[PDB]
Symmetry: C3
Subunit: 127 residues, 3 copies
């Protein structure tokens, strides 16, 4: 049937394997929870990292998640945009689903919450 991309993004405080794995895992887990995604219905996944992250391939966390051992995943370098979010891991998970495009739940965590499309910037936060 129809297939849909699911986006997510998250950040780490430091380029360490523990942080990259933990935050990638948490991001994937939230995407799964919000979209009700079963690993057998995942076509494939891509994860990107900004060029300030080198400790580990974030795909390791996907490969270790129980039940996800056959999900095809690979990584890539995000483009280096001047002023772009630093230490950022992004997902493109492709899933078989009947859920319409405008109801798919994309997930933005940690410092990537500023990437939510739903928000306008608050001009005065205090009064």
């Amino acid at each position: 049937m129809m297939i849909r991309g699911i986006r997510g993004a998250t950040t780490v405080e430091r380029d360490t394997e523990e942080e990259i794995l933990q935050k990638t895992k948490q991001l994937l887990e939230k995407i799964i929870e919000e979209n009700h995604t079963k690993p057998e219905d995942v076509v494939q996944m891509l994860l990107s990292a900004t060029p300030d992250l080198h400790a580990v391939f974030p795909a390791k966390a996907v490969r270790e998640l129980s039940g996800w051992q056959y999900v095809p995943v690979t990584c890539m370098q995000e483009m280096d945009v001047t002023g772009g979010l630093k230490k950022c891991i992004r997902v493109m998970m492709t899933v078989q689903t009947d859920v319409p495009q405008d109801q798919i739940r994309h997930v933005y965590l940690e410092k990537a919450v500023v990437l939510r499309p739903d928000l306008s910037l608050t001009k005065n936060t205090e009064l």
Copy 2:
């Protein structure tokens, strides 16, 4: 019906936000003109930029295109190839469509016209 990739590429003269969004929008518009693509039929999109481009994520132009705000898109850095076309933006748009693979209209604009494969289906269907 089936899912198919549509490829595009374009270039800019300068690493500026207005040029990268303008040429990326024009490339998407041309893809829509030629393939008749409706945003809800797009599974997902990937945009790449050569590493001489840093001013903006080209995906911004997709996110701002009227009706396309729910199309999942993310970017990546293109490889740096010796002699590779400079200042180039490429797209891979994954869509649901019944158009056969050899009729999908891949779009090469600006200096990326040098990338077109110049295939001959008139001959390939025969010999």
Copy 3:
């Protein structure tokens, strides 16, 4: 029919066009033979290269393979992980197939044999 990614990887001894095309073509042919892949059933392909490879886009091997000239493909840079495999080409081939996720045959050649899930761990018996 379901869509599924197929993963592959290989390596070259030298960053030359000749070796990159030779080893990418070998990798493609092996994926095709293990999965019985027909080009019209390929949605699209992505190929990544480590940042030590500049001589050619590995996608040239796909564009030049007989009957694959309408398979949409594009490339990206793999992320630079410390101690990541050097001179490595990775593939994500998206295909229409009824084969179960756990029976897809992912192909890892040359020095990328260490990326086989069943070999990646062998070193744990030794150090």
